[PDB]
A = this chain, B = another copy of it.
Amino acid sequence: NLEIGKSILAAGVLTNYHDVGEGQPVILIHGSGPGVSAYANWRLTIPALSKFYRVIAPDMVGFGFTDRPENYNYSKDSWVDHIIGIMDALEIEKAHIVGNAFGGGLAIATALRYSERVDRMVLMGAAGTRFDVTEGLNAVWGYTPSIENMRNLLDIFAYDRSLVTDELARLRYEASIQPGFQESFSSMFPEPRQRWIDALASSDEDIKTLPNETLIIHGREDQVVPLSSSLRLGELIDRAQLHVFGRCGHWTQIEQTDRFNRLVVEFFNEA
């Protein structure tokens, strides 16, 4: 299973992660769908970025193959602590961070609590602002295992449905039913789900204080997070650029891979 990588103790949690490349460190933080993992999210991103940077992609506690501690208290702050724990464990003093959706909210929160540890940020279809729950996100977080339910989620995630094959739905369905995966997932974001969008968000006031050069990315047709949310982040963060990809969903790094990798690498190259 290529989704399983290296193992390291971080913030007291045995963490699964990938580490490829040399040089300036870049932390990639995945989304929050069923069966999600750092590899599943970043398999097409790591190869490109690792040619110029040291890329670290961990499975956040509660997701992927990282340990799911008994009675663990999941929260925006606990996840931020995990990210910092991972950085501390790897002697990463300061790094750029690419946060995808769920991960984007965590990236913002980390930059706010540990400003000295974050350099540049890339926020893709990111959590971070309070936006009305979408049917897309409610469906994603309300997932129940089945190849048909997974196919529907994959359809929700991408613009070009021709990319959603029976094989992909099958493979992601299988990933979603691995031991303990669905159990922790279904209990992670229970109804009413607006609560978690709000809990993962940061205040307009706080976001305005971010001094980091930031690149906000969003797919025009994103069904999970409305473009309006990223437009808002683009107005709040001072040193920000906003790039909207037409004919693209909530899976920008996979749907517009080459354009995405190019934009991100050049963005970090400026530093």
Contact = CB atoms under 8 A, between A and B. Distances in A.
Interface of A: 220, 231, 234-235, 237-247, 259, 262, 266, 270
Residue of A235, A242, A247, A270 most packed against chain B (CB within 10 A): A242
A243 B246 contact: no
A121 to B, nearest CB: 13
Query: Which applies to chain A's interface (DSSP): helix, strand, loop or mixed?
Result: mixed
A105 to B, nearest CB: 20
B234 A246 contact: yes
A33 to B, nearest CB: 25
Contacts of A234: 220, 244, 246
B245 A243 contact: no
A242 B239 contact: no
Given A262-B266, A266-B262, A240 B235 contact: no
A266 B243 CA distance: 14
Of all A-B residue pairs in the complex, the 9 with the closest CB atoms, nearest first, are A242-B244, A240-B246, A243-B243, A241-B245, A234-B244, A241-B246, A262-B266, A239-B246, A238-B246
